[model samples]
Target: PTRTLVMTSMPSEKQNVVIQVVDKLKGFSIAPDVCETTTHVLSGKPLRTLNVLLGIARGCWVLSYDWVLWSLELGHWISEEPFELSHHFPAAPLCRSECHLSAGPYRGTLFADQPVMFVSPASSPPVAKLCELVHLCGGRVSQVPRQASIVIGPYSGKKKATVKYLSEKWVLDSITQHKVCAPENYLLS
Candidate 1:
């Protein structure tokens, strides 16, 4: 039973940061199941280089395809307007970037106030969502539990875990049907 991890990011910078975090996790022998970007590609390709630019542009194009498919599956409108496309692309100079090649002038953009979604396996959905929420709120996600933090931990089953968000730090006695107890502790590392 492998666990699934999901991360969402709209900006390349944040995507890079997430990749770095994923790398650190792998270093600790905990391989994250998902990440927004690939570190190998980011490190190997030089910024603004033709190859890198092409790759980014292509990625945008691919995203457009995926967005269309996703919209269709969800029974959403497939708008031809640029603004709608921008929600999916969210990068400037869409044609030059692999991920935004087909994006129109309005295509590569995002609303600052928009919320990001992170969905993971049921075992730790809350923690995964909280980590992403914290990141979106300009917080950090680290292994060590801290004040006003979330912790994620494996339960008795393989690859299954529990998520707890606490005001202060404390270890959970069990993940099974316990109510939010004293000590202001939750797990979501």
Candidate 2:
């Protein structure tokens, strides 16, 4: 019922090797993207890539590539604390802020039990994908305005006291950065 979501950041040549090694572990699965399900990122170095940002945003254990090789050699998953990448990577202030937020109390439940509604054809990401992200964070999609507390779409002058209309970027950033961002800042207007 539980699995480790381990992603890799390396050149294709090095990635293939780590991918193969990750595949061999029983409770581990290779994460293809930096999503809500991702738990760890095996990185070669700090490259200002989306993967690194999203990984830090999700509070995933950012580790050195050597951790995997050693784990494979030991025939068991090794502790990630000792190989953490913060020891080497020089993260920007913004990145560091997200890292702290991701490790906070709301790490995996930014949208827990919240009702979110999306406006299709207007959002950047497709509705289905957005829905998946909502559900992954313990929230449910609301089909009606009355049932939703968060609305994702362009600005509409009409507002509801109980609902907040915000841009699609709100959801994307909230999910990636692992925080329920301030609705006022992302108002669709």
Candidate 3:
């Protein structure tokens, strides 16, 4: 009953994800407004398209930074995977969306023996991914930072001095290395 548009500059290689985002907007027909760049100043098309997106976000739909904050630089685990937006709308393709991902290498409960703690805003997708990683790796997310074996999130200047404070890289790297290593190598600061 609604008409929609997919405004994006995502490379064709990654359009699958954009397609999925597009799918979620189903029931609402979308015009694929293809823009080829992330920079709006390069030309008039990207700039005009950018303005359209801004206008849509401002008054038409409800969205939050959480929906986009995880797009990489991302290194963002949660968004790197997928999150459910379909649940809110019956016909949307958001079928749903993690945990210590299925075991392969250093993937499984590698941290099962470790207790992790996090300090991040609830709306932050990066922190959400970090928490999910901790859960999937067999580590439990601690309610109290002091009680955790590892602490991860944006640096607040305040730290749990006794625990290992790390960046999300430490977790992602562990997935690649297949084992948990010292946090020093992946410090965010």
Candidate 4:
């Protein structure tokens, strides 16, 4: 796979540094915007901007810009474990192994195989964007409400007793936490 990269929410000065450094590297090209083709997203910090969250939701390797310079200086590509921004999630638990969470539980497929439907208002994230995220995270977009296992939105309408009606925060937290959070905590009711 061609390693397409995109940078977001970083200083222009730092962005330039990355461009020059990556210029010397092969097998990687930087994109001005985050898209489905993006494989890595470099950012100065772990702010949950649309680009950063989209990157994670797309299953891209969300990394710190420092990783780029470090690889260049070390004369080799470094393991991505340390630079992953998900490590900064405050609620993240300590790893059980010596790998220091390098082998993260879900890495990218947090919503693997789950059927998700979005019923959000215009104020919430655009349904199209959310659909992209859910799809990228291995979730199937359920077009019909009855078929959905998880419904994301603040719906107070007639309840589907078996379906989990959740808020958008649940999706955001699941991406940041790199785990499928319990539906109870984000129940719409």
Candidate 5:
């Protein structure tokens, strides 16, 4: 079974943070339900609240995409990774570099759960550029064609074409439109 992470927090004022994070999680293809434990922040609550958050709500190891997101996005508490929290002071969103909430223009969900791959020649600059662009837009890039949802380059590489193969134009166009574009417009011969 997959690890179920409960959403409790170190402390916060983000009433809708859970919903936002939950939807974002779903955007990543992770299906998790919001819990009452995720309604509000855990800031003013006494250590008992911590007991509830990490003790009752959390078993074994604390697990909740909300908890990780809160610490990384709105909350300034962070360490080397997304889940690791270094401190307990809430900082302004603009103050941190890793703040994923408003980190950039990418919806961070467009390619969520959608595996992507660059099928063009690795030596091509355009293909490399597409790699960066796809990753920034929340699309997963891989080296294997069958393992990808959106394959960059041409359909002839893997013999039988099934996955949605795209050209460099399609990947860049997605950024310009600021939404996941229709694959109908992009096809590589």
Candidate 6:
């Protein structure tokens, strides 16, 4: 015995069209399973979280500026609404630095001074530690520290690397007090 069920609800022509297409395809099959599922149940929250995380992991290690720009353009498909699948279906979260700018008060200062710096992975630790210290003190790394330009010779040994002292002109401008502090005076240690 065969059973046919007709379901109806709020007017959604798009949904109806998809159903119609499935029904048409069913005609060619020996058996069919047709059911009307609530649209609200498919709220897409879970899928959104999955896609956002996927994008972050993939884009984090990119080095080329052009590649990063391409990644940003590709990330729009995953991060934007009206989700559409494409070659870039899984876009990366807005480049890490871009996302950081969007979340912080430095949003305005980011472009005005273009504080984002591309430091070598080897040297990033000190800078990252400094930023963490600032955060611990309820402060933020407003700008890349400017220090006296010292020339370190080409990297040698097993892996090539360069090192330099943090600039002497460093100052942290407190948004709350509009005051500045030297690296040592900040007491971030």
Tell me the whole-model lDDT of each prediction, alpha carbons only. Answer: 0.30, 0.63, 0.41, 0.69, 0.43, 0.27
| Model 3 agreement with the true structure over 125-172: per-residue lDDT tens digits | 355555654554466775665566666666565655576767765655
TM-score of each: 0.20, 0.56, 0.40, 0.72, 0.40, 0.16
**Could you tell me the lDDT of residue 9 within candidate 6?**
25
Of the two candidates 1 and 4, the one with more favorable TM-score, higher being better, is 4
What TM-score does structure 6 among the candidates reach?
0.16
Model 4 global lDDT (CA atoms, 0 to 1): 0.69
Best of the candidates, lDDT: 4
What order do you get sorting by lDDT, best first?
4, 2, 5, 3, 1, 6
Q: Give per-residue CA lDDT, model 2, range 1-189, as digits (tens).
A: 454555555877668878777778656767677676666777776553455555655556777788878888998789876777663443323343444565454344567655656444456566666666565456667666566677887545468776778887676666555556777788765
Model 1, C-alpha of 69: deviation from truth (Å):
9.2
Please give the range of 10 consecutive residues that has the lowest summed lDDT in model 3. Answer: 90-99
Runs of candidate 6 exceeding 4 Å displacement? 1-106, 110-118, 124-164, 167-181, 184-189
Give the clash count for each candidate: 23, 0, 8, 0, 5, 2
Model 4 misplaced stretches (Cα beyond 4 Å): 57-59, 74-77, 89-109, 112-116, 121-123, 156-162
Question: Which has the better lDDT: candidate 3, or candidate 4?
Answer: 4
Better of 2 and 3 by lDDT: 2
**Runs with alpha carbons beyond 4 Å of true place in candidate 5:** 1-107, 122-125
Candidate order (TM-score): 4, 2, 3, 5, 1, 6
Score residue 169 of candidate 3 by CA lDDT. 59
Model 1 CA lDDT for position 100: 33
**Candidate 6 lDDT score relative to the true structure:** 0.27
Alpha-carbon shift of residue 97 in model 6 (angstroms)? 20
The CA root-mean-square deviation of candidate 6, after full C-alpha superposition on the true structure, stands at 19.8
Between candidates 4 and 6, the one scoring higher on lDDT is: 4
Residue 104 in model 5: shift from native, Å?
Answer: 11
